[PDB]
Amino acid sequence: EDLRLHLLLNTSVTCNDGSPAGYYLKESRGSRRWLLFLEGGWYCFNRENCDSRYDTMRRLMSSRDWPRTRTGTGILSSQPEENPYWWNANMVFIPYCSSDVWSGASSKSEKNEYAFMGALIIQEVVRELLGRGLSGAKVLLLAGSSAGGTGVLLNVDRVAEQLEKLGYPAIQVRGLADSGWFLDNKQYRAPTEAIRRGIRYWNGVVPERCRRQFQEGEEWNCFFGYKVYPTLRSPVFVVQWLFDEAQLTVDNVHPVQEGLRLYIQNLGRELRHTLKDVPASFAPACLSHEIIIRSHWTDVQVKGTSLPRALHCWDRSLHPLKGCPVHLVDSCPWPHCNPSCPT
Numbered sequence: 001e002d003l004r005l006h007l008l009l010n011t012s013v014t015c016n017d018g019s020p021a022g023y024y025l026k027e028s029r030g031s032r033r034w035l036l037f038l039e040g041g042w043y044c045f046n047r048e049n050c051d052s053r054y055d056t057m058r059r060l061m062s063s064r065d066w067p068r069t070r071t072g073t074g075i076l077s078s079q080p081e082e083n084p085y086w087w088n089a090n091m092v093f094i095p096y097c098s099s100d101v102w103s104g105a106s107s108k109s110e111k112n113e114y115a116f117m118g119a120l121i122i123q124e125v126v127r128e129l130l131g132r133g134l135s136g137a138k139v140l141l142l143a144g145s146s147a148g149g150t151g152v153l154l155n156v157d158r159v160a161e162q163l164e165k166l167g168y169p170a171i172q173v174r175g176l177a178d179s180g181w182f183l184d185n186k187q188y189r190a191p192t193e194a195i196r197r198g199i200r201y202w203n204g205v206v207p208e209r210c211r212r213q214f215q216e217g218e219e220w221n222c223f224f225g226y227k228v229y230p231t232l233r234s235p236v237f238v239v240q241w242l243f244d245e246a247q248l249t250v251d252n253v254h255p256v257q258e259g260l261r262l263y264i265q266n267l268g269r270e271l272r273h274t275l276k277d278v279p280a281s282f283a284p285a286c287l288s289h290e291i292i293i294r295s296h297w298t299d300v301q302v303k304g305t306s307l308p309r310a311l312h313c314w315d316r317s318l319h320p321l322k323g324c325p326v327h328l329v330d331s332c333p334w335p336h337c338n339p340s341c342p343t
């Protein structure tokens, strides 16, 4: 219970149902590193499935039932044994209560049953943290898992622009996108259409350079890592299982015969291909989902290097390095051909 809840002082920045959004914070006095983690949890894209989500996933739509505290785990842990990378950092967990992949900028109003304010929640958390010590940071790492990982891609450059415009050009903003790098591929038997509708429902916003490439009606393209990443200017480290369970779910993949074997192998090859020119990346050949906030996140290795090590090497690279790599993508072609994959 080491991160304490703060509801936003600007109570017009809200979760889906109009309750205040917020953040959980564990300060580390003397550390100038700040980790802001975006929670995941899918999304909803119309009145009817947002209503269903409100019935049975209400904590993802409302702060009314949030606990006072949360325990930091994985990269949010303050214990060096659990978090070799950033155990001494200031830790922020931002709950996902906007159901918009962190893209929304619309209030609950006369014509809107729900508010979709994910992009504004991030901005407001940053602005309020500046009064709590973020003004002295030297690195702000915006991290996130699943929908939160896509949220990092959609928001990291906006955080960088926000701090520049507020007068803090010395704070280095970086992104860590975990399990948010998806392919708009052929299904084995769809997201792009749900996101297209969601964006219109949420008044969703995407990074400016990506928006200018794809133009009106095509902003859904910017939710796909391999298309939005080249447009970003902040350093972003990408963590993605080659056989991500959520990717397989949307691909309608649930004794494996030839067609499915080739499908799975091609998925891993395509994912690996999209990471070829991503210099900071960690992509193990495993069937799994998420990594960075799991307590055993230290266990997986690619080519003998763990993710906490790769992230440390990335920090050093931002001050190639002898024995301290940052681009770690498996080349073996089948789930769990890497022996360190989670069980």
Ligand SMILES: O=c1[nH]nc2ccc(Sc3cccc(Cl)c3)nn12
Binding pocket: 040, 041, 042, 043, 101, 145, 146, 147, 148, 150, 180, 182, 191, 192, 195, 223, 224, 246, 247
């Ligand atoms: O939170 C979780 N767990 N698994 C998943 C899978 C997709 C998403 S949002 C998303 C991201 C990119 C593209 C699209 Cl079309 C949708 N969120 N998510």
